[PDB]
Symmetry: C3
Subunit: 455 residues, 3 copies
């Protein structure tokens, strides 16, 4: 009998197109290939982090945990799949009991004996009303939720390892520029020390140069700490150590990530795995509704066995000592004064709760992909302003170098312009890292790189 109600997908309350604004460009609309289709071998153009992701494909702990949990829920589904079949079980008994006089078969306290072994099925409940089929659907939906959870864990691990590698790649060049700053400040301090030893400058200019030398040295120590912490973070996110057979990495400013079209929100609930996980939870709640609905109807039970029984032990396996049994049973409670109706109410409440959580997850996913669209719309113009600033600092440094090589001004006002140059370009490298991290997070939230290659 059919008792699970018809499943229906709840409506997405968000707008069917992405909202616009001054930070956003033009919505390209729906496209042929969204971010769930492009694998991670095609998105990241650097081969080194690709080989790192290929290492983390098998050497990570949480991916192994989720891959085992998939098989766990598969075995839990197969347990209930086996429970639909009748359970054959060897049951061996034995009886030696005394009785009182008024209750005996003799009218006297005789010690009666009995022995019997049997095999067959006991309490074979027939799924006429779809209770065990509902539990089968519930175990199947939980297994599907587990594999969607493995997809989500793999995509988040890919994004985390990618951001850690790009952060290390940024901070290496930033440490190089801070070493350049320390060298510039050491040259400036040596020049002012020479000028103080000759007698032109006072002690105060020497102190005020040393106070900025110490500031550059402290910034160098901070950036070395950041480099080391990004290294040991990438080591943890990889599981194994950093390999030496890696290919040459590519620099940040040339494009390492391909562009993905924005698509539409609706295909995102077709493609993002946690929305499918909430959908599987909703279908599991509907299966529990079907189970609680099948709890109202009567229960059919069957017990059928065959074996040999006797009074003594050696006379059990004799010829003619066989015995068969057939008993059907029907159970139906009547006075359910708020037990089964409250259970059905509990199940309907669980379905409505999973509906609300499904719409909540839809709205959350829409919020983060809209934030990614905003970061995409703004970081290009931010790095354009940064690159123009670095260009202006470079022209300033070239003019100061021409002025120095003519002989008009000294090495001090060449050195400070040299300092301004790379303290501008390290603040280009910072926010180059931020556009790279924002694009990785936008690729992850739009469906992620569950597959390796493009479908």
């Amino acid at each position: 009998c059919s008792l699970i109600p018809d499943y229906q997908r709840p409506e997405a309350p968000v707008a069917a197109a992405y909202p616009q604004g001054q930070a956003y460009g033009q919505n390209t609309g729906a496209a042929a290939v969204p971010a769930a289709d492009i694998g991670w071998r095609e998105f990241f153009r650097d081969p080194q982090l690709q080989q790192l992701i290929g290492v983390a494909l098998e050497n990570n702990r949480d991916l192994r945990v989720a891959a085992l949990n998939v098989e766990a829920f598969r075995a839990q589904y197969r347990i209930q799949r086996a429970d639909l079949f009748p359970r054959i079980g060897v049951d061996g008994s034995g009886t030696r009991q005394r009785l009182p006089g008024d209750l005996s078969t003799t009218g006297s306290p005789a010690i009666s004996s009995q022995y019997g072994v049997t095999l067959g099925t006991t309490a074979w409940e027939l799924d006429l009303f779809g209770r065990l089929r509902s539990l089968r659907d519930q175990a199947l939906e939980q297994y599907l939720a587990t594999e969607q959870a493995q997809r989500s864990a793999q995509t988040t691990l890919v994004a985390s390892v990618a951001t850690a590698y790009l952060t290390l790649k940024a901070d290496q060049a930033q440490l190089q520029l801070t070493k350049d700053t320390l060298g510039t400040y050491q040259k400036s301090f040596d020049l002012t020390q020479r000028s103080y030893d000759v007698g032109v400058a006072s002690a105060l200019d020497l102190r005020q140069a040393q106070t900025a030398v110490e500031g550059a040295r402290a910034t160098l120590a901070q950036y070395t700490r950041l480099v080391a912490q990004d290294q040991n973070a990438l080591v943890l996110l990889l599981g194994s150590g950093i390999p030496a057979n890696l290919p040459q990495g590519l620099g940040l400013d040339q494009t390492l990530l391909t562009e993905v079209p924005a698509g539409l929100p609706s295909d995102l609930l077709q493609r993002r795995p946690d929305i499918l996980e909430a959908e599987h939870q909703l279908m599991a709640a509907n299966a529990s509704i079907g189970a609680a609905r099948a709890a109202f109807f009567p229960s059919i039970s069957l017990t059928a066995n065959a074996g040999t029984m006797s009074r003594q032990l050696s006379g059990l396996f004799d010829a003619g000592s066989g015995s068969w049994l057939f008993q059907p049973s029907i159970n139906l409670p009547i006075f359910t004064a708020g037990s089964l109706r409250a259970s059905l109410d509990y199940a309907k409440i669980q379905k409505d709760i999973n509906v609300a959580q499904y719409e909540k997850a839809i709205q959350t996913a829409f919020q983060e992909v809209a934030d990614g669209l905003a970061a995409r719309g703004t970081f290009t113009e931010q790095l354009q302003a940064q690159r123009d600033l670095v260009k202006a600092s470079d022209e300033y440094y070239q003019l100061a170098d021409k002025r120095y090589r003519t002989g008009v001004d000294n090495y001090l006002t060449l050195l400070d312009a040299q300092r301004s140059l790379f303290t501008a370009q390290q603040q280009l490298i910072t926010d180059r890292l931020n556009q790279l991290t924002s694009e990785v997070n936008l690729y992850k939230a739009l469906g992620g790189g569950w597959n390796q290659q493009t479908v």
Copy 2:
């Protein structure tokens, strides 16, 4: 009879008065109307914010989830309410079985038959010592805890929506001020371009103005990203988007909130819902003590059913085929190695755990309201210092404007003072937003607006 232990509320280890110091303002004594009495329609002075809170009352997911969970705990309380009543039902039974020759009463392999359809009570659980009453009280306490969870969720939602709207307004005002800064830098760069094209200024003075206008352009892009993302963070918490027919949003420095007396910490013992969660969990643990202690006592069961039974089928519904049953049983385990004793002291330990977390919730609430009192005592003076800074910069700009229009200075050293004016002025909107956020989550931490109107 009932052997549930008596309930006593533990003593809070906090100070009876609010702590004092230097930045602490003077306490206004006992609060006649605290924050839990004050509704959200009276606290926020903006009609636009109250309209969107009225939207978020009905069109959010987790606020619906909490109410559905309240209905769920009501249903599971009704289950253990119905548990006290006996469960009668119909039981149909068929029997066709062979017997061995030595064990039969006739001495033959008899294929005997039996049929019957009985009606009545089987295994009637009798609550003689309040075990089922203790489970009913545990279900009721969990229902009250789920009831308080909806108030906690509504207060956190009201605070989050209020702070999100305030951050949106503050970001819009700061975006307008960065637009003015970009206009000022554009005018100054055009004037330096004119001076360089004439021949009075060198290229270096052009390059530094270019760096200034590029840095301001990057800051404008960053603040436009902030404005674009805070609308997303608001629309996510609202569920729906921003409506078109909205009331006029009042100003940030204009009064948007009302004063709330902090009163006493003991009033928070009546008013913050998480302490009520810990209290309901404590009483549920006491109900579990009652259950585990009533598990010691003997359990009485009853089986009484009547109906028709026969050897054959069509002779079931005959005259005189009726028969009744009466079987009272009493089960009592005696010798264990402290099994039920371990269940009993396990439940007592669960009570002591709930006492300890009941005290830690009081300590967390005390620390939160003390941080709110510190922010209240500091922000009113910090914003006054910022306002004095703003008016000093405004007097500076006015004197520079008079000095410009008399002809003494050029437009550049008017524009830089005009620039310093609103770059100091955005530091009023910043920390005005922080004072408003501190007052909002202090209002939430004191109990919040669970009701719409003040009682």
Copy 3:
């Protein structure tokens, strides 16, 4: 016997030597006294902080929660320990039933009667293949896991108390130096007001001095907020009020901590308690395997009771009414579609999930210890840079004071020299506090002071 598979320790995937770099110092190899060896009392050299850890030893809430959960899992272990023994119980029985004529013993609607008081064992399983022993040491391993959770909570509490106390001292020193800043700014504003009232200085210098005075007055309120909020956090971590009988505190520049050797990656395999909790979860999953392995084997059941039965109520306690029963039973289900196989491989999969989580915990602990080693390798040079920066500003201030007292420059340049002096001085307390916080977190993650002294 026992079907439990024998346990052996999995492989630690990380490198067995601490990784080296430019910021990393020399590894001192393995050491006999790690962080878990010495107690917390001789580590923190402040007697006040030791007294606050001493009152945190008893007056905290989560420590009490952890000790009570330890006793809870002990009681749950004693439940399964008592489960080996037979449950001897008394079962009082009454029986009065009518029967149909074709099924009765007389051919008549006879009302048969029976009464009985019986005492003995029912359904007593005999642990032949080690299932109940597996559940017993499963609960025992969970109890040891809860003990390691208690140790982890205690070490986390000690680390949090130490960080809060040192942050209190740092914020107090920063508040004192910002008070000195407000004083010098007020003196500079008074001298500028005198110069404006005489007539030498225009109003613009007065405005731009007043803006600086307001900028320092904002920082004063911003730091006196943080002093009080950190006092609040300390009171929350302490669980009670701040004691008035405290010993004197020692400042941050004095030796507050002691040297702890980093040792080896293997030493944490013995000493950090969350790894011990993970391997206790390992042994719990292995005991789950050992409990699931007994389902394939036959199970023993026993039912044996003696007592007095009769047909009448008062005729129960009569001579000759004593009777006994002996009933053995053997159960073995045979036909399944992989039910018990999937349950067993499900338990094995849970064990493999546990080995993967056990490796992940070791990897995260190694990452945290690498962060602590990098902070130790860098904050010494950062503090040296801040210290000789302070010394340079002090020599600057002394030369400016000599130049003032000979009469060359005014009080104004002396005041703005003292301004930068204690600015660079308050920039030492930040990154002194960060070094001490990093060393406290390193001592926590390396094993912590679970004991009070060294043993």
